[PDB]
C-alpha cells in the first residue's frame, strides 16, 4: 500500500501536515522531522502562562477513549528550541494509516520559537536510536504493521503561492520529480546523515576540504553549517550579518554565484534563486538568505544540515531498507 500526507507551506520556512490523535480523533498540525524520532503535541495540562499553549491546539486524553496512561517524563532537545512533558499512548492516524503510538504530552513550551510556529507539534521520522526514551518511532510501527509497499518515504517541498508539499509513506510520486534518483549511503546508521566531499563557492571549492558530514533535515527551514564554514561562505557571496540571519542587497541578489554540494560523486547545485529570498530588487532594502550558521554538537555534529532550501530543488527519498538517501530534481 502507499499513503500520502499533504503539507502546507508557510513562507517557505514551515511545512506542516495533519495527523489525528485519539477517539474521536483530535486534529493537530505537525512538521515531519527527519532530525528527531519522538512525536509530540501540546497537552491540556500545559499551563496557560506559557503563551504558546494558549495559541496552539491542545491534546485532551479525557476526550479520547483509546488513550492509555504512561507517566514517563520527556525533554526533547532540538537545536532551536526545547520542550518537556510526559509519555502517553493513543492511536494516531497518519494519512489513512492508523497506528497505536506513544507520544509526548508537552507541558512546557517556550514562546521563542514556539510562538512563531503555525504548527502544533512534531513527528520524528528518525531512527530509534536518537529516539529519546527508546520509544519506538512512528515509521517503525507502520513498518511493523506490514501495509506499505516499500520500507521508505519521500518529501516534496514546493515554492509558495500568492499545493504546498507532500510526504508519501511507502514510495515516491513520479509527478513531483524528474529523471533518475541517485542514492548516497548513510555513513552511520541511526541517523539520516551522509558524507559531503566539499561545498563549492562559484569556482573555488572553498568549503569542505578533506570531507564533512551532511544531515538531511526535513525539519530545518534553511541550509545550515558551522559558524566558521558559513563564515567563509558568506565572505564569498559577500553578505552582512544580522541578529541570527545573513543578508544582501536585493539589487545584487540575482547576481550571486552558484553554490554546489558534492554528494555521492554527483553534485547538487543551488542557484542564487534557490537560496536567496528575493522579496524585491531595491538598494535600500536587504534580503535574507536561506542559509544559517548553526553549531551542532556531537555526537551528531558538527554537521551541515540540508533542510528546506535544498529539499525544494531535489525531491528526497529516505530508503529504510537499504539505509540510504536518494535525491532527484523536483517538479
Curated annotation (Swiss-Prot):
GO terms under cellular component: apical part of cell; extracellular region; extracellular space; plasma membrane
Glycan-modified residues: 70
Annotated active site: 33, 217
Activity control, per UniProt: Interaction with ATP6AP2 results in a 5-fold increased efficiency in angiotensinogen processing.
GO-annotated biological processes: amyloid-beta metabolic process; angiotensin maturation; cell maturation; cellular response to xenobiotic stimulus; drinking behavior; hormone-mediated signaling pathway; juxtaglomerular apparatus development; kidney development
GO molecular function, one term: signaling receptor binding
Domain Peptidase A1: 15-328
Cell location: Secreted; Membrane
E.C. designation(s): 3.4.23.15
Reactions that this protein is recorded to catalyse: Cleavage of Leu-|-Xaa bond in angiotensinogen to generate angiotensin I
Keywords, alphabetical: Aspartyl protease, Cleavage on pair of basic residues, Disease variant, Disulfide bond, Glycoprotein, Hydrolase, Membrane, Protease, Secreted, Signal, Zymogen
Disulfide topology: 46-53, 208-212, 250-287
Family: Belongs to the peptidase A1 family.
Quaternary structure and partners: Interacts with ATP6AP2.
Role according to the record: Renin is a highly specific endopeptidase, whose only known function is to generate angiotensin I from angiotensinogen in the plasma, initiating a cascade of reactions that produce an elevation of blood pressure and increased sodium retention by the kidney.
Disease: Renal tubular dysgenesis: Autosomal recessive severe disorder of renal tubular development characterized by persistent fetal anuria and perinatal death, probably due to pulmonary hypoplasia from early-onset oligohydramnios (the Potter phenotype).
Record protein name field: Renin
Segment of the intact protein contained: 72 to 406 of 406
Amino acid at each position: 500500500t502507499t499513503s500520502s500526507v499533504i503539507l502546507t507551506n508557510y513562507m517557505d520556512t514551515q511545512y506542516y501536515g495533519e495527523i489525528g490523535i485519539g477517539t474521536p480523533p483530535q486534529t493537530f498540525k505537525v512538521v515531519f522531522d527527519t532530525g528527531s524520532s519522538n512525536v509530540w503535541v501540546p497537552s491540556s495540562k500545559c499551563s496557560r502562562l506559557y503563551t504558546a499553549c494558549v495559541y496552539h491546539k491542545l491534546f485532551d486524553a479525557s476526550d479520547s477513549s483509546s488513550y492509555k496512561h504512561n507517566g514517563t517524563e520527556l525533554t526533547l532537545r532540538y537545536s532551536t528550541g526545547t520542550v518537556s512533558g510526559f509519555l502517553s499512548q493513543d492511536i494516531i492516524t497518519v494519512g489513512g494509516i492508523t497506528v497505536t503510538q506513544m507520544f509526548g504530552e508537552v507541558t512546557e513550551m517556550p514562546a521563542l520559537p514556539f510562538m512563531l510556529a503555525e504548527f502544533d507539534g512534531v513527528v520524528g521520522m528518525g531512527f530509534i536510536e536518537q529516539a529519546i526514551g527508546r520509544v519506538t518511532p512512528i515509521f517503525d510501527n507502520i513498518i511493523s504493521q506490514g501495509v506499505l509497499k516499500e520500507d521508505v518515504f519521500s518529501f516534496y517541498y514546493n515554492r509558495d503561492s500568492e499545493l504546498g508539499g507532500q510526504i508519501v509513506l511507502g514510495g515516491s510520486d513520479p509527478q513531483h520529480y524528474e529523471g533518475n534518483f541517485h542514492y548516497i549511503n548513510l555513513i552511520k546508521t541511526g541517523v539520516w546523515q551522509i558524507q559531503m566531499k566539499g561545498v563549492s563557492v562559484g569556482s573555488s571549492t572553498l568549503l569542505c576540504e578533506d570531507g564533512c558530514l551532511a544531515l538531511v533535515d526535513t525539519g530545518a527551514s534553511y541550509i545550515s553549517g558551522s559558524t566558521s564554514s558559513i563564515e567563509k561562505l558568506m565572505e564569498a557571496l559577500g553578505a552582512k550579518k544580522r541578529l541570527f540571519d545573513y543578508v544582501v542587497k536585493c539589487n545584487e541578489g540575482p547576481t550571486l554565484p552558484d553554490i554546489s554540494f558534492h554528494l555521492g560523486g554527483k553534485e547538487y547545485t543551488l542557484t542564487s534563486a534557490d537560496y536567496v529570498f528575493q522579496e524585491s530588487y531595491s538598494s535600500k532594502k536587504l534580503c535574507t538568505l536561506a542559509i544559517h550558521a548553526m553549531d551542532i554538537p556531537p555526537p551528531t555534529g558538527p554537521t551541515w544540515a540540508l533542510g528546506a532550501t535544498f529539499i525544494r530543488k531535489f525531491y528526497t527519498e529516505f530508503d529504510r531498507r537499504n539505509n540510504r538517501i536518494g535525491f532527484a530534481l523536483a517538479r
